[PDB]
Amino acid sequence: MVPPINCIFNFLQQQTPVTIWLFEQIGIRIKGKIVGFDEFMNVVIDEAVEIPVNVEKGTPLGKILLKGDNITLITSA
Amino acid sequence: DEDVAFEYEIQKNILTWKRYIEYWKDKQIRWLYERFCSQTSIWEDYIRWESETSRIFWLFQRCLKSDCDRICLSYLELAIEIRHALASSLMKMEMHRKVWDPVIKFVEEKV
């Protein structure tokens, strides 16, 4: 019963580690902690770690503003 | 040649004039259309095709021989590109108070 802009911000208050999927690029995923966003879902993320989908490694990228037009699917852990 | 068949078509409602001229259109087209004409809209078309100065003048003259008001505009334009021409136009096809006035205003300007 929650519209999605009120369901982004509960990642932000509770500060959950969040897995985010890209858009028409299935080999790589990004995982991190949501630190900021906007009305067009352009997301600034903390502790950003790449996930090669094809053992899942990581390259620590830390602070990333991920532009929302490649954002697909927002989860957590 | 393509002109033999065309000729046959011609000689045997402006469809032969269209098929000969508009298919070619350039020189060939000119040859055709003009010929057809000699054998208002048609005149206009011919003029367009032509579009040298002398030729244009000739065309205008031809048109004048036998939308008079409409033509008069054309005459005026020709003159611009005069007074004599305007006079000629007036004498053949005597609506033309505002055009006459305009013409005069050139004289006035000159003065």
Binding site: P3, P4, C7, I71, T72, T75 | -
Partner: protein, 75 residues
């Protein structure tokens, strides 16, 4: 913008297919004018034959530019 009427699909187990030929089942919590769909009970259906239970109660959300379509599993 008109509201996309998915009120029939509220609290319903739906099946979102996603660009890159991804398929994600879940239960709808919310939507918006951009059709950004919130799913309770996230179930990632991957390729061969696992079924990745992704977010069981943590109400995932999918951006509307990546949603291909949706099948309500129930009526």
């Amino acid at each position: 913008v008109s509201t996309p009427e998915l009120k029939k699909y509220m609290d319903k187990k739906i099946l979102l297919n996603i660009n890159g030929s991804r398929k994600v089942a879940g239960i709808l919590r919310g939507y918006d004018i951009f059709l950004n769909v919130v799913l309770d009970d996230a179930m990632e259906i991957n390729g061969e034959d696992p079924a990745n239970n992704h977010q069981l109660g943590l109400q995932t959300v999918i951006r509307g530019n990546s949603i291909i379509s949706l099948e309500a599993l129930d009526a």
